[model samples]
Target: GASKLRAVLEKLKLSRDDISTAAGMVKGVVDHLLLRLKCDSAFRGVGLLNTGSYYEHVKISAPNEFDVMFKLEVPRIQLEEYSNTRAYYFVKFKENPLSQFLEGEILSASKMLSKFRKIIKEEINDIKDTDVIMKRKRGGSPAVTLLISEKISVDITLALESKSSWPASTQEGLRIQNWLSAKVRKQLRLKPFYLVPKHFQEETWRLSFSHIEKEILNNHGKSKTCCENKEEKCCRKDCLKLMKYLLEQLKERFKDKKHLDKFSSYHVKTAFFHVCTQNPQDSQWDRKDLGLCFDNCVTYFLQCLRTEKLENYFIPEFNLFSSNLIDKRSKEFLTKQIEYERNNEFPVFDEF
Candidate 1:
């Protein structure tokens, strides 16, 4: 079973050359677009950050999807948490020439996003050689997606770069003292968090920790040497990639995708984090037992699914599997689907 799982993983792994070329194209296109965007007053100081699964090194299969955060620098800002949902916050900043994008002294996400979207659409055609088209807008999503040459999908998010102390709500979250030391956690907290033009309300921005997430996942070894040289490497990341791939195939098998709507790669990544914390020592995740390690993660995800509770890794009180996010029926359906994959040695993977 282990070797077979290993074989499956080998198939799932993205080759170095493929990533290099795809990443190169993305960078070139973004750099070109940003050059034009900088000419505009609002985006004159905007910065770019390559984020999400691709940057996290957990992306599987085709290098089709990408996440780029366009950092919109903000002045001194204040945050007001929405009543029950600990995730969203109303942003406040003093009035400026950027007033068209403000709402009653609060920075308006909708207005900002609308102006950004308009500028992106106008400037998109200026980048030569690639047929870059803005993807259809999806309500409630923070990203303004762009499809390059129909093969590459780039999701650009407008982030308010604030130097504020990490949220008090998150002070109790991301408990990683045992896995990564307290000193390391403190250092990470100092780096700053981001607020994207996301929503629960139009004036609200969702706090994003993508850079922090990438930092943790990049240095994801209990021992510093872990995954450094070939000998020190573990199958920990491969296990995550497998779980991600497994979830992807499972989501696709059903004709009506609604059953798996509540789940996403973020949920899998969160589960993987828990699995690592559970077995922190490098010796425990030895590469030779690759098959078992992956099986362990699938089992871990199954447990989370069965319980129907996945808390945000960065915010403890925020339930990822909330009643609104994932209904009892959707949870059970995914449970059955994953159970089927495990029982059959993942023939869905075999079919690939």
Candidate 2:
């Protein structure tokens, strides 16, 4: 709960100029968007009011893991790098250089604003005709404010400001709060970690990505007939390291499979999926099922963190991000293996 701002800034070697340039890169992108939306008039009617400068401070929850989110507003500029010299992105990409160079600050800010815009648009569109009257009274005129100040005077939480600072009534404050929550989930993929029992070593509790191994390879061989070096080198390494470590811990904890065997393959797969995400697999399995497994394992990990009740673990796996760390084209080769497994394993339902 203490401020990690100073520590993170120092660790990332961030300075005033680094922050300013990032803000400028985003400002330029926004300026282009505003001009385009305004040309359509119907899309953006009210000219954005540049209220000098505004700043919002974000508390980084898990500095060791996920990136923080910033909801900064700024004027548009036109350059890849600004007078301050920093990179920015209007679109998401794998291996984001800005995230690396800027240390996730700029990316976090851009993502937050994008999430806010999407939330507002979705909320407005969902309004019923009758409800539109009530909604319009709160906020119909669109106003833009670009954050441009390297020097912000306000408190980080904006706690001193009342709901009246916003144009709409109390209802608008509620909307903003909801928008902020969604931004955390959608933009930041924010995760809260779990607490472990005193008996569990923090190291063991942190072990994730343990389920992948010879079984996965065996399954892949029968299904895939081959494994790519990318998957073997990166995904395989992370998974084995985590699981082997955890299995050894289990041996120490209970001395038998009785407790471990109770864990389903789904549980193991789900936990490992989280850690092995550096190279994501596009599967023939139901995407919803895959997503459920991923989300649940992540949630469970967090739940354990908070409750001191360890159910499972998920390690950091970047395979899902891009293949620079591991080549991804080999995934195509794995696809036939997946389809083949489907038929052999479920022969009764193989009519498809």
Candidate 3:
């Protein structure tokens, strides 16, 4: 009896200190699992995602229960990586704070956050360290300016860690789009560079894909405001970065290698098929309605950013550039089913 309880306890992964006020959180998860186990053990394949803040958050799918669940640590890491980039992209603030920084806001934010993490470790809890938060947070909003050779210049939009909500964010994205449109129009001294076709430039595609993917994962389930954590990396956070890292790895392997001829042909066919099949002028499948845009954005960014040129690259895979993008793909298909099957066909176990 003790062993069985201990087994469930271990599976739940919360120590007494971890959830002083959330004991039911663990019981709720275990009970959900046992009930599913009674129905079919195959459902154990589903994993949990601990918010690491507190409480065991189950992947609740059924009408009135948590059907698919896994431990928080691993799943959270996976979910967050795919979702981080999305959050980054979705976020926008009033000021382009990065515009104020000289070495470029992109370099500044990365360096600031990395250093702040180490600097805060001495007495991270000290309230006076609030200025560090201000500095790190302020440096995060500027868009990146890419010097794509001497002839070609591209400006990139970076995510902001602002204190805002969905309504505010909608306004933010729209504003950035409009502002950039005007800026490009003025800078080029001509009509703006409109949203280009889905077809990426052959060489630059991978790196772009990497950045987009990062944004998708970062924002998936994150609450609207851009919050900072002075705390250690937890399951959800690590998994988010990890999944993006995985994507980068995939990009690296395929970077030097050209797309398989067959795959390229298939893509071309699909593109033509959609164009010929669907209305070109129709607004039916634009960015706003196309849920796949988010997916494509992340995948596209990752693929675009991936290059095989570096020798012993820093991460040896992907960077944190867009590791925080949100993934609409997983949120769509993942929670659709609520059915669980457990096997009770085995013989009863002996009690202690």
Candidate 4:
């Protein structure tokens, strides 16, 4: 049974040419793009953080899309919890002239992001390349996308990198000691948390720990080696790829049904993080049990949908499946669709 799932994972892989070529092409233009942004006094401290599924090695199918974060160095700051959920915030900063456009005591995410887009649009418009085309910004998305000549799309996010504590909201979250070592958690907690632009009904910033996420996925294992060699392999990332693939296939199939729009691969990854802690041992995810392990993950996701309480892995207070963010109709519908696929043994996955 797991052999059948391995074939699907094999089917989901991106080709070497696609990976190598896109990596080269994007790096070339992104470097030029960064130089242009850094020249502006306001963005002088900008650094790049390549992120998302592509960089995380959980990316499946086309190697076209790349995610990058513009890490704008911010000095010491204060965080004011914005709403009842206790996750989002209003960032306060000094009278630093560099960030004047983004503040009136509290940093306005929309203002900073809007300005970030304008500057990027202006710079990219004159860039010395015919292959790149900037796409219109999508609704409620924090990223600006770029369409390359044929097989590449790049998403850009502007995030404030504040060297500070993990914040109290996260005190009860990101519990990984039983999966990853205690020393590992200490170093990650010491790493800076980023504030991303979010217009969630108020001028506020949402928290992100992408810096630490990439580390855990890559170094994941109870033993010294997880997926390091052919002999010692764990199907964790492969399982993420398959579930993400399953969810994506459903989204596309039900594209006409508006209720299925709220869920995304991001939610899939968050649930995957929770599943990891529950099944800590690498052998539990032995490559040979891919089918059973993957099926168990699907069951975990179903439970999240039914309860409507999928916590943001970093901030337990933030419910990703809250009724406000995703309607009850949406959750029920997804539950049905996933159950359909599960019961039918997923003939839909064969399309690829």
Order the numbered candidates by lDDT, best leading: 4, 1, 2, 3
* lDDT (tens digit, per residue) of candidate 3 on 1-352: 1233233324334432343423333334334333443343222332222233123122111111111222211011111112322222211111332223214212233433333233322223243312211112232211222221132222222222111122111222211112223343232222111111111111100111222222322432222222234221112222222223323333333456533111211122122222212221223223232323223323332332242111111122332222132133322221121011002210111110
TM-score between model 4 and native = 0.93
The alpha-carbon RMSD values of the candidates against the true structure, listed in the order shown, are 2.5, 24.3, 22.2, 2.3
After superposition, candidate 1 runs with Cα above 4 Å error: 14-16, 19-21, 50-59, 95-98, 139-142
Higher-TM-score candidate of 3 and 4: 4
The TM-score values for the models, in the order shown, are: 0.91, 0.18, 0.19, 0.93
**Candidate 1 accuracy as lDDT:** 0.76
Model 2 bad stretches (over 4 Å): 1-6, 9-20, 46-352
Error of model 2, residue 218, in angstroms: 58
Estimate candidate 3's alpha-carbon lDDT, on a 0 to 1 scale: 0.24
Model 1: how far is 81 from its true place, Å? 0.3
Q: Output the number of the lDDT-best candidate.
A: 4
Candidate 1 scores a C-alpha RMSD against the true structure in Å of 2.5
Using lDDT as the yardstick, the better of models 2 and 3 is: 2
lDDT of 4 by residue, 1-352 (tens): 8766777777665352343767667776677778888888677888786532233232355566777677887888788887676778888864563566654677776666666677888878787765888777654344677777777777777788877788899887888889897877888888888888674566777887777877887788978777888777888988888888888888888999797878878799899999999999988988878899998899999999999989989888788999999999999999999999899888778786
Candidate 2 residue lDDT tens string, 1-352: 1122123324333442244443333334334444544443223332222222222122121111111111212222111222211111111123322233222233233233233344334543353321211122211111122222332211111001111121111112111112123342222222111111111111111111111222243333211422443343222322332233332333334444243423223333444433333233333222224333333333433342233332222221212212332133333222233344333431211121
In model 1, the Cα lDDT at residue 126 comes to 71
